[PDB]
Design a protein around this ligand. Structure first.
Ligand code: 5GP
Ligand code: MN
Length: 349
């Protein structure tokens, strides 16, 4: 029994084209797509106003396809999971920094998180790396002055994710830019022939943040977009797979994985516990996280019995199933934070 997972690189707002290719696959092969994974540049612009939050050169200030799906005119034929890249409606993604559905069948994993589906554990890390913004907090509500910095990956995600492989392995990890140095771990001479511009960066190509996370969790698969090319590499037990850009034939590939249990999309318990236990660092809605707190120190307080109570409370107020919520994203921001705070304060500390 096997499941077929579509892995997609850069979408850049070409949703109808993406879903067509996926459909062409299910007919070319007669195989069923279980769900879709996307590695960023989703450009989930709801309406014209969101263009302000899209960091692109002027000629790429375009609405794209997403609003069609936001409006219900079009409907995603598959459950689609994604992280953010460097070309996003960053205001929308900041509202949903704790993850959320942007529309039917399209789930954003947030700044970072781990989810559960079909017996698999999947980790996502949004954004691209810029050293000068790695320690920068998020400011809320979103502001047009931060269009150039909202999509930069923060250092703290490392401490947020580092313990996730303690109780079970990670099957798939997602990032937009490549883990730094992994370019040297495939046929890089061949890669440079197709992509001569990459040779200059050498082993420094990619995100040092994703490099750390990969080395720490050692997932079965690490999948990345950003670089506009197909590429495979092996870092120890980890299969690295880079994907291209929609419109070109290197953008989509497929994972054929053993299917033990068919199971709806669910929150990962270990992630949920980290989420609750780090609440003090995220308590200021105007500016988070406050790094006068040590994320590691906060997470060190997790215990078997506390985790059990947390998951019990999460199931009660939110549910383990990740379900579609059609409330505006500003409402979802406040709502999810309300329950995280409620649960933390119920533990007693
Ligand atoms: N040499 C080099 N090129 C990069 C690097 N990061 C991004 N690029 C180039 O910039 C493009 C970014 O595409 P976009 O993010 O606009 O979809 C990549 O496809 C790649 O050609 C990098 O670190 N080094
Ligand atoms: Mn990109």
């Amino acid at each position: 029994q096997i499941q077929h997972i579509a892995i997609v690189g850069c979408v850049h707002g070409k949703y109808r084209e993406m879903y067509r290719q996926l459909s062409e696959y299910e007919k070319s092969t007669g195989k069923e797509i279980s769900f879709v994974i996307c590695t960023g540049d989703m450009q989930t612009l709801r309406y014209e106003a969101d263009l302000v939050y899209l960091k692109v050169p002027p000629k790429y200030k375009q609405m794209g396809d997403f609003h069609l799906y936001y409006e219900g005119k079009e409907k995603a034929p598959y459950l689609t999971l994604f992280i953010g890249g460097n070309h996003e409606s960053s205001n929308v993604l900041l509202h949903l920094y704790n993850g959320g559905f942007v529309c039917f069948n399209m789930y954003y994993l947030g700044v970072c998180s781990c989810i559960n589906i079909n017996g698999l554990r999947i980790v996502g890390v949004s954004g691209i790396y810029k050293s000068f913004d790695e320690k920068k907090p998020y400011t809320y509500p979103p502001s047009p002055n931060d269009v150039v910095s909202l999509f930069h990956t923060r250092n703290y995600v490392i401490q947020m994710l580092s313990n996730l492989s303690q109780s079970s392995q990670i099957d798939i990890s997602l990032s937009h830019d490549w883990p730094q140095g992994i370019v040297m771990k495939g046929n890089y001479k061949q890669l440079y022939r197709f992509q001569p511009g990459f040779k200059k960066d050498g082993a420094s190509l990619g995100s040092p943040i994703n490099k750390v996370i990969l080395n720490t969790l050692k997932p079965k698969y690490w999948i990345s977009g950003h670089m506009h090319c197909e590429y495979h590499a092996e870092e120890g037990p980890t299969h690295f797979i880079a994907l291209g850009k929609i419109g070109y034939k290197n953008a989509i590939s497929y994972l054929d994985l053993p299917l033990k249990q068919k199971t709806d999309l669910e929150y990962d318990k270990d992630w949920v516990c980290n989420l609750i236990m780090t609440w003090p660092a995220f308590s200021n809605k105007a500016q988070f996280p406050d790094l006068s707190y040590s994320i590691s120190e906060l997470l060190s307080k997790r215990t078997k019995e506390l985790d059990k109570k947390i998951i019990e409370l999460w199931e009660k107020y939110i549910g383990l199933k990740i379900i579609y919520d059609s409330d505006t994203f500003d409402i979802q921001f406040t709502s999810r934070r309300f329950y995280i705070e409620k649960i933390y304060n119920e533990l007693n500390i």
